[model samples]
Target chain A: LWFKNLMVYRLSREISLRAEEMEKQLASMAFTPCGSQDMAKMGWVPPMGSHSDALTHVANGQIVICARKEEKILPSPVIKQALEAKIAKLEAEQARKLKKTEKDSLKDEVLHSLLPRAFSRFSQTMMWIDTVNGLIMVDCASAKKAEDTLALLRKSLGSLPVVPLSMENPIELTLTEWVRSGSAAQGFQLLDEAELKSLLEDGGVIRAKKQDLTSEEITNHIEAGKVVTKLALDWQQRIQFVMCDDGSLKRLKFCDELRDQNEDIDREDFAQRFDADFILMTGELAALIQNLIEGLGGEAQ
Target chain B: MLWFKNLMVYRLSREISLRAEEMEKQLASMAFTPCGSQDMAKMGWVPPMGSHSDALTHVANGQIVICARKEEKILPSPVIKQALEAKIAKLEAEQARKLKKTEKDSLKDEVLHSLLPRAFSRFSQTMMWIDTVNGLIMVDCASAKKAEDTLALLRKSLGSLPVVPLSMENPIELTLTEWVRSGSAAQGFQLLDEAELKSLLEDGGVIRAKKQDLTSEEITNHIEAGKVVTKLALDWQQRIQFVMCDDGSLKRLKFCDELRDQNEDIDREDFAQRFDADFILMTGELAALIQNLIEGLGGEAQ
Candidate 1:
């Protein structure tokens, strides 16, 4: 769960890049924070493109960028309880029906207490709909996990091929290699746990796929970048980059800086904490993320 | 707020009724809960029409039934201190717009915290949805003030018509007048006030209306049967009756024997005590609230 919080910074970066493209294409606009001119408002505009412009991609080619954190509770519990209660209530109602005289009752007996109490608890956290861009940032946990989640979502949406991406591109992995790397580095394990719980709880787990990030080695292209890969005891690990990017995608590369500040990551911390196999050219890969967003459909006015 | 809750309940009922009717008449083999020996499993049936049908309704015409409660944080002083910071950000955004850069930017960057976290607590109660036929009864209160609260709720739900009855047929008066008429010779008003205060605070004031006795005026020739008029003050009272038809019409009825078995007198007001049933009812309400499924469909599921 702790790891999930860090995923937000990565997700924010992907969103920032998408917004940058929209800014450049004049499809959207940006505003400085009312309180601080240094901070850019986290808003995006949809440039003139196919209706698909509404869709935002994050991972190299397969992952979808989502602002929501993945958790079983975040996805659904009310629906699961409702379905289960409906089943039980129907059973009880059927038993009673056998003994009673038939009456043409048209009452909508919303059987009270059929749904689970925990259902509404997560409503605020579950990004069912982001009123901002008419996009839904449902809890998928991270870009690496978004692969399977996006696939399942796309299938549910009639196999529309809605792209899912790792919000943060690793410093320097090509598109193909990112897909080949297993769940250890990409944050796919948490998604697996979420799916397990969803199914065990008698709730439906939608389509899912783990994102491949080895394809776009962000570090390889950027000289001043640092790729921090954290490996845990349970064969769990995550790769992140702290680097700068030219303002090719957006006017200000502020979101990245915020990530560095909030995470308390100085160059020394970066060196001491992470396996510095991928550090140089961190800046270029950051720029590449925005460049990819521009290639998708984002443009300045 | 009471009116809004009632309106929502009414709307929900209307929607459910329409949906149930359509399911029964047009759709084949609708779902239903069990009743007895006959397994009408495949038959198109609706629920809550049987004698033991668990129904819910307002006790009086004008009782406020609390529905939803929420807590929100109020703006704190830190947020106030960031006023200049917000101004600067706004100015910078203006500059960007003037430069013909982007059209939209988030304003979430202003002083993040303004008010020390203050909680805006909300309590929502409604009246229209409570019902006897649904087997859901509201425990009534003893105090006129508490009753008045209910009256406000009822008025909000349906109209002033219900609240007027509380003033007209005070249940307290009926009991006091009975004790007086029965030679108890007790200080009726003083006793009633003490009881009202004791009951209203400890437990919510939802007394059983049927347990209260009626005055001679309540049983007059013009008065409808099964309809009850309760004594509030000397020569003052309120009425209680069943909604006989869907048109919101009222009918008076006698349930004194039932009241007696329930350990209540025909003429005296009865106090509804806290019990497991009340807890169960509340639990059910909580469960129903959790069925906020429409949100899963990517929208506010009303």
Candidate 2:
């Protein structure tokens, strides 16, 4: 596999990270199981899941890195209920209202005591770093999650000179024009799904799915001043994904024909499969990213 | 073959006294209109069966189907924030001084005034089915808050809606867990693989399992460890399949082949005909499933 989403970023300057050096630095923050009372922790993990000691997996000069974040599960409602009871009991015994400072301390006491018994849930985010082109593709839907992964990477690497993929013009303006003009970038096909929003601060948002984007109803919406914030686009009849307002791509999918092109790939051999899959994905994605940036009118100064 | 994908069920405590014609007339007073430049969003009743018909209320088989069309602006906060900051920076640089609170507030108002005209409007349609036969109202939405939004609009239009969320005597969590533990369910309701479990201990976590046998030894281990089912998927007599939740709501609904095939003879390409057939069939199918659910959950609390 390819990434499901790309929280795209551009290196401020080209990152010259080599596999040996990067892996060693990454090992300094290598994944460890959470302690009993720890609320949360994050560290590097193998991109290929298991049986791999390498923190950074390189295929055809494209680097793959992953981070696992484990968070203790503490339902807020339970804590709220417990804190309420504790506060109420204290107020009754003292015969007066407890100050905000006292209530805050009491709540902290409650959570601190409840921490050890709480279960934990772990999640991971994958990233493909292209040193050659100075790009980072975080395969997560959330911007904060992608940034957190980046933050961890920065701490390990000493510093990460990166900024999010920026557009020369407002993306919504370009996307809306594409729909309105019934013309898209060369080889890109506009799909049915789209989300349009008004420009006002308190504006309403329209989340649309499985509806014709160029239809009269939608056309009227476009005419009335709704700009396209998210749009589903098929690139060169091979890859399809939603281009969001934030310049990230989501639900990226490769057509069956494209994936089947690598039919001779040995599934029995894990390393061979990983090698072939990563190479294939990275090659196609590099082209798609460049083509997409061009379509968005190049990067902002 | 259009069927409700989700259910936000409500009990109709008082009967809807308006006839189809009178109801449509009342709805027309609050009919949908295009949003003006200054307004961020506008909502009103729209024709249930596409724009081809003037009929706002589609009545087939004593069931009334009405749709609410809402148009909202899609102005993101990030965009506004960026614009405001840029404006503030520009003003501070030009004036050779930092902008105060008064200047910031005035700058914010200016940004809104400039952005309001260029904002795009998006249209969404939420449909509601009023089952007069069984005195139930079902809104096709994922969130109960949205269902209430639709109900509030209807209540405002028709003057009153004395309704509340349907309640059951048996705790759904206990019933669903029992179904998994005993490998038995209500008549015609068979267990599906998907399940959501919550721990009995207040501080415990939740687990969602799907596409795996819930009756297997693995799930039994979880049930034995004090996790009770909060949501359980069930197939209803091969007529419908949906996940029943602890709150007495249903989700991820799917109508079966036998049910959808009933409308095969109808001309689905025709909007009015399709709407009529689908509405009638959906109402009829949902009515049976909900009734079975109510009775199975130890009957309604009322």
Candidate 3:
């Protein structure tokens, strides 16, 4: 039995705090946010335009979540300062020290996506990979798709199996959801200045990147072994993230098949044997895909 | 208020250990030796050049001291295993699931350098800079002049720093004192021949990297912030020595001057107003200089 196993429960709160800390931490760090398809599909918000940058795409949702968590009814100067301070502390303690000046340094940081049952914001998925993991967290919504993605990734670029994680609760319904849920009124509803102000002021929708959820926390594991391969369904919702010591992402994804065995297996032995190094696709291919995505005005998560 | 600080310290330690344990428990993980200059130094003792790279490097009147303090040994294998098991248990408890693959990890890992310090084979001097606040440790040794050479070769390279780690306690002696200590005329000074191998076993001198004098218990701290920057006078005391983190003619050296305190003059207001990024260059320059000495070994410590 490793001390790490014993430390997990005690450290859960610590990890959660750290993850929450890291979410706010990325605000000042270099990050490029892309748009989301799910948000556009919901139709309560603006339509997806080619010009939509991911940064702004989730900023509103994230800020609303942050406000809800902080118990703030509205986004104000005070809320911004508190967020800024929290971000600064994380930057100084973790993110700043891990930066490598070289171009390929980003490869050292990997991303894993653990989602809720119905993750509507694709931007959150992208952010999990880009801002949190510093790499793309593969998105697989279905059981078969998750297995297929893992197998294909393993075949093309070798992968190692890792632990499974939990999921998050569903998002709350908004007045916007109310309108979309039922076709009571056919005409388009326009908000007056006061109505818009009140709607913006009185909602509890805290969606800050759960700092404990980023990919930096598991870094020690990656350094000890090599890869952080895992599964999730609500994995998207759980957002359990950690960083390797040398700054590689512990690859986390969702798989439904292992739901039963997850409670019995010995993870420590598994990691020592299979978790070390897995062949990852070279940067040349990643860059090519990135370029293609940019070319089509679509982005890679 | 006084008790609160003590309480906070206790809380922080408990929390850090708990958190570290939490992560450790989740994986069947093993630590791999990191690649660096220290690994390269150990390769010198392999075969043909197993002895001192050159005999000329070790001269008479050269003094050396080897001190042993054993508290600094890394965590035992069993403890490491325990830590990993706990981490896994924690993960399972929280997730209500098991790891997808938890049977393939190992505990007996290898470090580039063994616990013992071998004979000092190469003679070289080094000048290094130390930065503690920022988690950047590097070195520049004048004896090798590699840092300077490296700087001249590539103006933009960020070199690694060679730290006078607080964890290592070195054997030190004045050059004159050492010459008298190794009395060749004594009964033990006879040169052994190949025929003597069957008669008896010949064990040479012993020097080691010490754990007792290490300034801190944390390995990470010794790595990042524990390096002491100063001029060092190095000499080859033995035929061959192994450098664990960085390979070079030097293993340990004496300080040429007092450690420079860069922050001694700053007032409270100035300290409060200054941003960490603003001082990056100051610390970065120091780290670069130290890296050169730790890697380069062409001259004396001055």
Candidate 4:
């Protein structure tokens, strides 16, 4: 499946470990449900949700892996009520309020009592490891979860050295200049949304939306000293995304024209449908990412 | 002493002809009212100068200062959640059945209805400076949305608010970034000990250093990693000190002792002269500072 958001990392070296090897290693950490008292449990799952033995999905030199996390749901208020009820009973019966220590002890007892019976929630994150470019893009909104996913993979295979993407120049300065000058790098179309930031303790932050970026007002912010931190942009009408100064792209969307390139495929056929969309999406996204990296002046030396 | 702390500026698109007296009369039609039991929030105009004046509009130097008070009946989420959970638990326990979406919502409604009277009310007010002569409206708000609330009520009260958000042709970060990199700011402004840095050395992580030397290697270490300086602290001609944020807003504004006490010197014991003295001096000093900042940031957008 196509990625919605990209939490990106740079792999130190290319991955020559093909799908079979990854599958072998991933088995060791395949998802295990939470124990009675375990707060959470996480591990790899098949990219194809169900009815598939393959743990990895591969196409276009990219490896797609999915991680599943099952967390027990114990609402804080649930435990709070239980503890307070006990506290209230004692306070009313004993004719005095419970001390903080008594309240704290009851709170822990309520937690241990509720652990197993609490409902569980399931979530999964998909990741694309671009062996060709040594880029690992995790479909995660929380960067730490993506980092943990990477860590999980590392522990399974025993090694994964990665760092954040770096650019040759200060990325914010260049993007702000582009916005200030009302010019984007070639093949890139600027959209109507941008986050502008000023420099100083207590400096201002402007989230400009539904307004022309080149206008006197927005450019005034540019000239006033705010740089573009997050910018919404399009690539040759093929992909749209909000590019952040931190080298992560969000809201990655593919054009409908590109989506229907496989319209002729059987609609009822799940296997063919998966292959068609996968090839179409990854093909378009890889190019979009490449064009964007070049636009950002081609990765730092 | 009571001047604007944060300035979320807007430009008046057209001239407004209402005089201070007439405006005050118009505002009375929408005077402040406390929150009703069913209402989540209620907004209306309030006296700008507290009990000292009953007038809704305070006019000074052809500029009008107005305040909008917003009252919200707060049923804090945690409290609501605590109440809702107990009800759900008790019902589930007695009936031995799980609650569905509709039933849960119905129970939640019951909880809210029962708890409405017990909820506390909160009051927050925003003060605004309407420079009729200059076509500028500066509201005291930490966020753009909060200032919009001020203008929203003002628009309803004044009949129409022909105003646009104040934006600069150039962003402030470039200049602040330049100043941080070069270790200097424009004339009459001296860099102080605080900064906010971001990006790869950034949001990368918002690294804010307060009371740390600005010119030292510890600060430069961030810039070395390609982190852009997003906020800096500086003093304007030793009169006002403020933290410059990347979004064309300033914070932590502190008028120098000399400028602050000059008004106290105007009246040693009388509260009447003291009020006007502080208000008059604050408005003028902040006005000049705003003018200098606008010019420094390359003037308001056309």
Candidate 5:
């Protein structure tokens, strides 16, 4: 499956195993549906669904893996009511109030009984392993979900040494300077959306929408005191998104021209469609990241 | 235990006679109902239970929490549309004429109603709390739609919910930009990691920076060049870290060790007490900050 959003990470070392070797290792730990009493379960799944035997789909030095997770949802009231009923019976029979430990055990027992009946929610995360570029991109917005997927991959492969993508240059300092000077790095342009806040006590914050960021009105505020916390930008006229101070890129948008070029692709065959889209998207993103990393004076050590 | 992930703060416009007991009675009339097999969605209030008791609404210590639930069927729009189109085609052939757009819409509605009973349901809950003393209302949801849904129900139940989002008079953008340019902390906050800066050029370029000091001349020069600061992360009272956006949204909130340490020494038997203490401390600190900001902005407009 093609990824919609990416939480990119840098691999600790270059991947040396061939696609076949990785797949062979992953097969032994394929995803299984959550058990009745299990709170949560995570494992790799066939990228092409259950009908396909392959654990991953690899092409052009890019590997696509799918991770599925199922978590059971048991409402607190359900367990609390059960526990209350048990406590009432035990107290009445013994003619004494139960101790805290006794009550906790009863609560645990009730939870175990209800666990099997709890409804389960399922989610699938598609990851792109760019071995050539030494990057792992998970199609997830939440860092927790992305990390969970990464952890599962590590369990299956026996080792996955990776770290979050970072830049050698201090990103916040550069961003603040850029806004102060109204100068952008080459091939990038600023958008209207921005968030600014004071660094001192009280932390006064400002968010601008649709207003010209370079205007005196905005500059006046900057002059008084505040640093940019998030700013939207278009990179090389190909990608657009808001970049946060935490190195997370949000609200990603592929430029219309690039998107339109792929509009005529065949969608009837999902495998082919996925392959084509993944290649195009990843290729564009990889180039953009490379440029960004270069602009920052290379990746963080 | 009292920590809220998302906050939608609103100011009360006028005083009302809606007591907690009365409000509970009113909300009970619109209590949550299970979705029918054919029903597409349902949304209504539910009891806000305490640790040991089922309260119609959790109201105490000048605060009231109203819980609401929303359930929707797990039907795909395309699948339903396709099924409706098939029925429309069959009927059109049988009648030997083309159906009008309105007629097709009616057919689609009928199809939806017929399929409602068989659809699987998904549920989500949101909590809304009102600080009666401060006349502030907040909803624990990141989505505007969900917040509006709860507000609308509250208005219906009490016949009024005159509230507006907390805003500043000088515009938060100007204040934030000034702070970054001067590299001065605003009153009670400290600068943290992450910033977004934009260029004032016609092309409108932008850059994001993280884990860097904000007080440097390199950053100041960028500000002088007509760039605007959009977002800034800050530490409030050394107890919380939050990114405040110009759009009145505070996100990525984290309570630092200063607050966490207060509860660490407590025993398991004191969990409830610790929870209550944390709740009071968190809400009190935030409310005070909000009040200070409001006061700094010359108070709310009448």
Candidate 6:
């Protein structure tokens, strides 16, 4: 499957395990659906079907891992109502306030009764490992999801020396400079979405969309005391997304023109088509990440 | 007790009979239907009951609550594509000829329809309130498509829905761009956490800043280069921090911590009352601000 979003991380050191070895290790911890009593569970799983036993897919110097998490959805109000009723019954029968532990036990009992009826929601998160580039990219939008994927992968592999993406130069300064000069890092074009905030206490905040940002009004706001914290940009008209101060690129949208080029090609072969799409998407994102890191004066130590 | 995430306002061109009983009778014809086994998707209205036992179409208060439910089959794309391929192959072999692209496309549709019956179904609900007093209809949905769906149903039931996005005469882009550039808080609203600025060039870029100094020359130069402010997070009357976007979408709305703390002093029964009081106060202020914004733009009072 093609990665729709990129949540990039930097590896502190080289990965020790090879593709086959990593696959064997992860296989021992293959994902199983959440049990009735379990609220949530996450583990590695085969990217492909059972026909392909490989849990870790290695192709073209990149390793891919799929993490599946299943969470039970039990509405809080339902449990609260059940617990409240039980508590009220206990208080009335004993004609006294229950102990804290007694209330906790009753709450647990309510949860047990409700557990079987809760529906399960399953999510699959994919991560790409670029050992050569010393980067790990999780296909998720939120930092929480990315962290969860990394945590599960670390548990499976025993170690993962990685850190959130950062740069030698503060991205805020670089981005602010780029916007001020109306110049982008090589191959990147500015898009029509940005957030600026004032460093001054009670200083105003401004957000711009679909307006001329280089106009006097924007300049005045910048002159007034705001700096850029998040910026959206297009890379060679191929990829578009917002880059935030936290080194997170969000709201990513691959240009339709780029995807249309591959549309006419006969993709009747399911696995082959999937592989091709994945390769193309990952290749573009990898290059974009490289450009961003280099433009920001290289990766942070 | 239902809260709104978005508002889509419309001005009625003429006074019409909008009595609760009459509107209810009209809406009853379009009541929601549960999806059948073979149905791929279904969307329709439902009675606004439960916690809100008040009349669904409150003519006296000039508000109507319409709840819409949508159910769709959950079928992954790859599986559908795979199944379509098999069917296409069988057809080509049986006919002893290659299937045309258009024919293959039709086959895919047929395959989807055939498989839809067996696919798992998912459901979502949306609520819309039409405030005739302000001539505004607000949908409690973050999605544009769902909001439009409700509008469409309303149109079908009432015969017409002449509406445009709630907007000020002066473009919001200009006002926001000026405020950020000037570093001035609009009369009642204070600047909050974040703001997004964008370049106007076709291939122009965007920059988002948070907590950092935004009034620096580096940021100003980007503005001078033809960038505009598209979204800004602002504290509204010290009660709410919401990101107001160019599309009139106010997102990431949070009641300020101060307001949340006020609930601590109240008991559980009184907490609900306090919450309602806070909600009314906040909404009133927001509505007043909206009125002022429109008035500033020289818009006529509807």
Interface RMSD of each: 32.5, 25.1, 29.6, 13.7, 9.9, 7.8
Evaluated with lDDT, which candidate comes out highest? 2
Candidate 4 lDDT, tens digit per residue, A1-301? 6678887788997666667888889988999889988989999988877547677888878788889988766666656767778877786568454476777777778878877556556778998888888888899777888888998899987889999878888779878988977988988988877877777766656664444566564576666676788888888998888888877888988788876777784766666767677777776777877877788887778
lDDT tens readout by residue for model 5, A85-184: 8877786568455466788677778867877655566788888888888889888878998889888888877789998877777666666666888866
Q: Report DockQ per prediction, comma-separated.
A: 0.01, 0.02, 0.01, 0.02, 0.06, 0.10
Q: Which 10 successive residues of model 1 chain B have the least lDDT summed?
A: B189-198
**TM-score leader:** 6
lDDT for A123 in candidate 4 is 75
lDDT of 5 at B134: 91
lDDT (tens digit, per residue) of candidate 5 on B1-302:
54666677888875667677787788888888987676678888876543543455765567777788888776667557767877877876677677577876788788777755545566788888788879898788776778889899888878877888877666766677787887775787777756766654546545455565667664565577677777777777767777767666666768776776777767746655665666667667777766765554345554
TM-score of B chain for each model?
A: 0.22, 0.93, 0.20, 0.90, 0.82, 0.81
lDDT: worst 10-residue window of model 2 chain B: B203-212
Query: Higher TM-score: candidate 1 or 5?
Result: 5
Compared to the true structure, candidate 2 yields what TM-score? 0.53
The DockQ-derived docking category for candidate 2 is incorrect
lDDT of 6: 0.71
Query: How many residue pairs clash (N, CA or C atoms closer than 3 angstroms) in each of the candidate models, in the order given?
Result: 134, 11, 124, 46, 58, 55
Least accurate stretch of 10 residues (summed lDDT) in model 2 chain A? Answer: A202-211
lDDT of 1 by residue, B72-182 (tens): 232334444455455656777666432222322223322332212211212222222333233222322223343344434333333332212211122333333344234
Order the candidates by TM-score, highest first.
6, 5, 2, 4, 1, 3
The C-alpha lDDT values of all candidates are 0.26, 0.81, 0.23, 0.77, 0.73, 0.71
Residue-level lDDT of model 2, residues A122-189, one tens digit each, is: 78888899888888999999998998999999999988989997888989999999989887788688
